[PDB]
Symmetry: C4
Amino acid sequence: DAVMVFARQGDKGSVSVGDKHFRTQAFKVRLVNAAKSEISLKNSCLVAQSAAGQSFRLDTVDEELTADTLKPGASVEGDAIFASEDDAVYGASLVRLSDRC
Amino acid sequence: DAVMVFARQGDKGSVSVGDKHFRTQAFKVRLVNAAKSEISLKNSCLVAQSAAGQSFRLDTVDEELTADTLKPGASVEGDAIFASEDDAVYGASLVRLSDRC
Amino acid sequence: DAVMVFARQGDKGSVSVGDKHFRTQAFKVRLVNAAKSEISLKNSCLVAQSAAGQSFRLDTVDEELTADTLKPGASVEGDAIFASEDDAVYGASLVRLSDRC
Amino acid sequence: DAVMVFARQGDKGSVSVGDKHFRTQAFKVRLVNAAKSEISLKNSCLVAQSAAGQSFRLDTVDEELTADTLKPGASVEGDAIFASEDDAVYGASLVRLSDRC
């Protein structure tokens, strides 16, 4: 009765504007409903984090990953790009769903 | 009189379901029998490990790598994906055959 | 009223001549003027740096990235390759524009 | 009056046979004679090393990189794969020519 989250580490990068800087870590994410009922994602969000429990904000995400619900057997996929001001986001090793959004 | 194991580090990733999380390290593996006799793999398994001797469970493996035997000169290849709950598996640097399966 | 700098970490490398050695980190860089006025880059330069503020010299850069100005909505892109004598440049995680050139 | 050595870090890997294991780091190497005279490479060899000066044996190399000489303007390229028993070779960041072969 929970959505399955598959992530693969992608490109590392940065964004700078004047003296405002941040680092980025991209993941290719696939969400899969392997249960027998429709699961709502409306009050859920994607969080990337280190094994120590440090989490990182989502900077940009492909529209497909923001589906409100996932019917049984349905799958959505796309890129999700997380950020930190420093280089901490490079240690993000897990993408998961939170309901604290 | 042992099978040769060639591995190349591939993608780093993760799998999450509810609050059950793990990290993944993929390798492309090739097994080669460079001896003069057939070698049995029936009671052998692929293990990934760090240089310090810490080993990691095999989460998924391509069917081709689970051949029961390898005749002389035979070669099989495919992906093998190992896991840890935390990010330890990212230090797996060796794939080898164990007979403790 | 500042140019936006998008960078993605690319190849790691080295250059050696006799006993003169250095390490290289490439980035794909895109510069974007998202403001309403033309912005001059004539006295600006690309700097790569670590989160701790350690910066690295630019060894080579694609001609497209050395435009003197960027009109509104204009974008230029190319590779930029930064260097260190030791392996410090591998921790460069940000490309930004400096006006101290 | 020295050959120029350009290297780019490639795949990380391993080789195992029975309980004999090693780790591998591949580089794409290009050798370039940018001088005005023919330079002999007959008593030279490719060495990979860390910034601290730790060096690693050459396990395999493409035939093209073992040219005996390089005439003016000549260039040769190919892959070179270096090894360590443990995972030290993963810190090799420089390929250079030695005359101690």
